[PDB]
């Protein structure tokens, strides 16, 4: 029945698989994965970003004790200081003769960089997660299907229902707690919400990028005004999204498990290249090519017509095909070690039809799964090589 693909997940490369179907004729795949997303039922705990000591304006009651009024930004460092004698033009702005108090207040406030090029924490749960694998079958058609956990939301994206395992993105490569810095996503703790203090990335907790309320301790320290005269000393130390960029965790857009990269995301895993994606689909007859084309492909033999030593597509091999009934026959190597560019290859009884492929060596004895019949296209060729070129079109690879 189902859409066989046992052939790995990559990205860049136009990599392929072959659907073993016996009720209908098999169908070729080009499994082009380059979009992968997670997206669970989640909750945004706080945007984070480094401080900006946008020195607030205190309600200085002046001398005889000063009381610090609660400003619309929760959590604030405020410290009375006496022994001042204010000046701001002329004289004191406090009501003692020179026994004046200056109540310095400084809270951490959202930076202008918080708005754009910032960090963003998440508690990442599961509720809506998706394993996304596009297959442009090529023999048939496109489908970019997803998986969904919540059942008031369709998982019938694509042609029908497509099941991945090892999943292509229904896991998170990052932890439950994740901090983010541009490209580099660090799967690293942060302190819950509404409690955060310095010594972590998430010490700043603004509920939005540019906010009105936040939780403001990033190791902001008021100290005694200089010269026994008014003003606000704000001593500010490093914080989340300043450090942890060289105190860094694992920078997932270059080190993600499941071969992915990550960025500022509502929780997604771009560009995955997981161990393998064994794709299995519950699809009608439309996703397959019909049995009338060939009930079973009866006889065939393959040999080169000059091949490649490379997983560039240029390898060719005639195949003296034969079939129970003549028609189309989608093809691809059933290991994907030869990645076949032919969506369909024609079969007539005792004819011969060349197909296109990419292999990886001078003697390409790769099976070709000619819609219910395998065949080795052996023969000596000339060796072209080029093996810096992107992720396998020979996938499942670990050979020459």
């Amino acid at each position: 029945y189902e859409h066989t693909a046992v052939m790995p997940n990559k990205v860049g490369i136009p990599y392929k698989a072959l659907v073993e179907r016996p009720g209908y004729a098999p169908v070729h795949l080009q499994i082009q994965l380059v979009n992968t997303r997670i997206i669970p039922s989640t909750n945004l705990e706080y945007i984070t970003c480094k401080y900006k000591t946008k020195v607030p304006s205190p309600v200085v009651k002046c001398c005889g004790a000063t009381q610090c009024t609660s400003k619309p930004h929760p959590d604030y460092q405020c410290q009375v200081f006496t022994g001042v004698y204010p000046f701001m033009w002329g004289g004191a702005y406090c009501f003692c003769d020179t026994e004046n108090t200056q109540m310095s207040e400084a809270y951490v406030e959202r930076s202008e960089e918080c708005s754009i090029d910032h960090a963003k924490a998440y508690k990442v749960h599961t509720g809506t997660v998706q394993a996304m694998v596009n297959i442009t079958y090529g023999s048939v058609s496109w489908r970019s299907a997803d998986v969904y956990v919540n059942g008031e939301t369709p998982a019938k994206i694509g042609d029908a229902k497509l099941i991945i395992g090892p999943l292509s993105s229904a896991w998170s490569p990052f932890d439950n707690k994740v901090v983010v810095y541009g490209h580099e996503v660090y799967n690293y703790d942060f302190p819950e919400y509404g409690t955060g203090k310095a010594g972590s990335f998430g010490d700043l907790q603004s509920r939005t990028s540019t906010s009105n309320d936040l939780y403001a301790n990033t190791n902001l320290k008021l100290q005694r005004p200089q010269a026994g005269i008014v003003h606000t000393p704000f001593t500010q130390a490093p914080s989340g999204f300043e450090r942890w960029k060289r105190d860094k965790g694992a920078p997932l857009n270059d080190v993600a498990p499941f071969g992915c990269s990550i960025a500022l995301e509502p929780l997604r895993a771009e560009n995955c290249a997981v161990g393998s994606i064994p794709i299995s689909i519950d699809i009608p007859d439309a996703a397959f090519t019909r049995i009338s084309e060939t009930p079973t492909v009866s006889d065939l033999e393959c040999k080169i017509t000059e091949c490649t030593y490379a997983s560039d597509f240029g390898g060719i091999a005639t195949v003296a095909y034969k079939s129970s009934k003549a028609g189309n026959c989608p093809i691809h190597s059933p290991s994907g070690v030869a990645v076949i560019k032919e969506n369909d290859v024609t079969l007539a009884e005792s004819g011969s039809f060349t197909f296109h492929f990419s292999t990886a060596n001078i003697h390409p004895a790769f099976k070709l799964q000619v819609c219910t019949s395998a065949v080795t296209c052996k023969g000596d060729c000339k060796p072209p090589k080029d093996h810096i070129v992107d992720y396998p079109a020979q996938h499942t690879e670990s050979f020459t």
Binding site: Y1, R21, P22, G23, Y24, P284, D285
Partner: peptide
């Protein structure tokens, strides 16, 4: 009917 219940496209009897 003899078969209803959303079909079984044959590659095997009742596949």
């Amino acid at each position: 009917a003899q078969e209803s219940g959303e079909g079984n496209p044959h590659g095997w009897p009742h596949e």
